[PDB]
Amino acid sequence: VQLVESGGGLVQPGGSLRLSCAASGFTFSYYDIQWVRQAPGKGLEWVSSISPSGQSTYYRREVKGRFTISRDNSKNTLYLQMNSLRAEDTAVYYCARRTGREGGWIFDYWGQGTLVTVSSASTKGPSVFPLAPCSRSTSESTAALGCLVKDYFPEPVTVSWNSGALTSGVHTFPAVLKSSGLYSLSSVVTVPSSSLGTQTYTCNVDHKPSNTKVDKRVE
């Protein structure tokens, strides 16, 4: 089953944003489909629901009058128009399928979610700088390299190494929101010290809200 969410991004308070969820792999028209959200570092809360034909819809008390769920059973797509957005609406929004037995509201499949950031801060692309040691070591067998992804907004950014050909030993740290209202993070990788002069190490940074794409050669 596939449920791919999109439309998430930065929106100013009082603003509107429309989310989409695209289904494939199953007969979409027969199942109730849900929006379930997860505030940063918090649990799960059901948000809205929609019957197979679109007749019956249900909303969480704090979103009624602001949010409207809709569906297109020919495109196999679900939507969430969100108006009068507030800071507390900021969350990853998951579209999830409710079982099609008996009934029972069981979310049997979830998409990977789309992040909605309700803030008045302006969009900013990051600066990407290499992280390399001061000098050659001569004694250790493993070396560390990285990239600093500095002063950006909003989340998220994705980092990969060598276009995804290097995943082993990669650690992309959770970003930190500094007192300046901007995010920073590091992505590091450990590789054999013997490969430093033969293999190239490039961090690929993508910041979709600001349409920023940076490939940074490290060392």
Partner: protein
């Protein structure tokens, strides 16, 4: 309105051992209760429904039990890849409410960190800023002490830390400590050191560089 309570909200269980998770409902939900697994960066995945019934695809080590108000999710023979937050959900009253979650940590053997220090790149100094980064890689337990020194002067209040989620294969954590300072202050000192204290180390490890050697 049915509230679900998952207490304790954290468990630390060794590989191969048994983790027992609790979920209590404010009112009886009979056996209309589901269990979900949520690994970091991912969406929840259905493990159990009907309080005791395993979803197709789910390993036999994941079991559910209980009725009415009291439920348990048992994870036998704990694996590294079971590192996740587990949520209970009742569906007695449509569309249901979720519990606050219990994070299961895999209590693997002690692993000392590998420490690396990174001076600011020349391209960062050319941008007008400086910061120095200390990487603590692949360690367990999560607790660690990082102390910065600038020309042997102990620093305080000027560093930010970030910690990864527990690794799904090796069950370790990684930590970055970033010493925050102006480009001007960075150019006014010579030696930058980060000293690491961890239960896997008998004596603290210091990694340092001299600005002029970079």
């Amino acid at each position: 309105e049915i509230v679900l309570t998952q207490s304790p909200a954290t468990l630390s269980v060794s590989p191969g051992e048994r983790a027992t998770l609790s979920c209590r409902a404010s009112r009886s939900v009979r056996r209309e209760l589901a269990w979900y697994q949520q690994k970091p960066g991912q969406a929840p995945e259905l493990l159990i429904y009907g309080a005791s019934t395993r979803e197709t695809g789910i390993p036999a080590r994941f079991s559910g039990s209980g009725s009415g108000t009291d439920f348990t999710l048992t994870i036998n023979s704990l694996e590294a890849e079971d590192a996740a937050t587990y949520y209970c959900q009742q569906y007695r009253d449509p569309p249901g409410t979720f519990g606050g979650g219990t994070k299961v940590e895999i209590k693997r053997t002690v692993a000392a960190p590998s420490v690396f220090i990174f001076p600011p790149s020349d391209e960062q100094l050319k941008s007008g800023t400086a910061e120095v980064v200390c990487l603590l890689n692949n360690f367990y337990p999560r607790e660690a002490k990082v102390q910065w020194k600038v020309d042997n002067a102990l620093q305080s209040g000027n560093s930010q830390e970030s910690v990864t989620e527990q690794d799904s294969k090796d069950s370790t954590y990684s930590l970055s400590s970033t010493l925050e300072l102006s480009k001007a202050d960075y150019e006014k000192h010579k030696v930058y050191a980060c000293e690491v204290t961890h239960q896997g180390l008998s004596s603290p490890v210091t990694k340092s560089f001299n600005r002029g050697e970079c």
